[PDB]
Amino acid sequence: VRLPGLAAMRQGTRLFTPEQGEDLREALRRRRGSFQTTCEVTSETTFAAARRLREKASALAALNFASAKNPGGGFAQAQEEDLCRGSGLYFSLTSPQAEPYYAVNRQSHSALYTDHLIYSPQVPIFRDDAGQLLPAPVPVNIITAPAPNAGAVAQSRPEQLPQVLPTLRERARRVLGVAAWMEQTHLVLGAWGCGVFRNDPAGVARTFRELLEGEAQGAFEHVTFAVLDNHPQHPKLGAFRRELESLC
Ligand SMILES: Nc1ncnc2c1ncn2[C@@H]1O[C@H](COP(=O)(O)OP(=O)(O)OC[C@H]2O[C@H](O)[C@H](O)[C@@H]2O)[C@@H](O)[C@H]1O
């Protein structure tokens, strides 16, 4: 039998296309200055920050460090694999509405990908970081979008290297523009693009920091950066703490 919440979530899944970029900015701009934005940088998983924020959260959204080409990225280290194995996310990512995002991204034949985002409403989290049931599932809205594959660019088309950073910059602003458009209060962000895709965690953490200080200033209530980091140097975790000190 199908798990509770899946049908509602899949049917509410919705595609944002590149041609709606200006719609997303106007939503951000209109929402600027609405709160005293509280923000933190943590070492929790993306669904652990979500799950503790839930009971406090008017409108809770989290970012999927998604594949551009296959829902769930075809599958252990990776965060989207984590979200798919412990929630209904996959059932939403394979939905009919969502298909143009993978179809176009594959057709682009560019490691920078395109500007489609998938909005999955009320995705039920079913299991903890350790994989047993939750009391009851806890729903979270999930914004899925692919960071540019900086690794692939370096190895397959270095000529797009200078475009890497502007691409992640404008796509992040679409990411929070979707969160503003869907009127979220609590945003779970993190080391977007910084693992498999090999983006500089310094640039990523900062690019956020700029937007939460510029166009996204005050647009959200609480923004936590859940950055899992089991590497002893804690490189990703450190660059996010080091560079989000102004805002938190
Ligand atoms: N559950 C987690 N929660 C929070 N942070 C995490 C988690 N898991 C890893 N991190 C941290 O986040 C950093 C980046 O996690 P990555 O998963 O590589 O996302 P990308 O954007 O770089 O690559 C996306 C591709 O990887 C997948 O295959 C997708 O299908 C895509 O194909 C990690 O180094 C962790 O420190």
Residue numbers in the entry: 29 to 103, 107 to 279
Q: Could you give the paper's own sentences about this structure?
A:
Despite the abundance of PARP1, most of the PAR generated by DNA damage is rapidly degraded, with a half-life of less than 1 min by poly (ADP-ribose) glycohydrolase (PARG). The radio-resistant bacterium D. radiodurans encodes a PARG homolog, DrPARG, whose expression is upregulated after radiation damage, so it might play an important role in DNA repair. Our study demonstrates that DrPARG is involved in catalyzing the breakdown of endogenous PAR and DNA repair in D. radiodurans. From observing the structural peculiarities of DrPARG, we show that although previously thought to be an obligate exo-glycohydrolase, bacterial PARG could exert both exo- and endo-glycohydrolase functions.
To clarify the effect of Thr267 on enzyme activity of DrPARG, we generated mutants of DrPARG by substituting Thr267 for arginine or lysine. Furthermore, we determined crystal structures of DrPARG T267R and T267K in complex with ADP-ribose for understanding the detailed interactions. The crystal structures of T267R and T267K belonged to the space group P3221. In consistent to the secondary structure analyzed by CD spectrum, the substitution of the residue did not cause dramatic alterations to overall structure compared with the wild-type enzyme with root mean square deviation to wild type of 0.50 and 0.43 Å for T267R and T267K, respectively. The side chain of Lys267 did not form hydrogen bonding with neighboring residues, but positioned toward the side chain of Asp260 by ionic interaction. The superposition of the modeled PAR trimer and the DrPARG T267K structure showed that the n + 1 unit was blocked by the barrier resulted from ionic pairing of side chains of Lys267 and Asp260 and implicated that the ionic bonding might be sufficient for establishing the steric hindrance of the exo-glycohydrolase mode. Compared with the solvent-accessible 2′-OH with n + 1 linkage point observed in wild-type, which were inaccessible and less accessible to solvent in the complex structures of T267R and T267K, respectively. PARG cleavage assay in vitro showed T267R and T267K mutants with decreased hydrolysis PAR activity as compared with the wild-type enzyme. Short-chain PAR was not detected in the filtrates of the two DrPARG mutants T267R and T267K, as well as the TcPARG, although the mutants still hydrolyzed PAR. Since T267R and T267K DrPARG catalyze the hydrolysis of PAR without generating short-chain PAR but oligo ADP-ribose, the establishment of endo-glycohydrolase activity was not solely accounted from the lack of steric hinderance near 2′-OH.
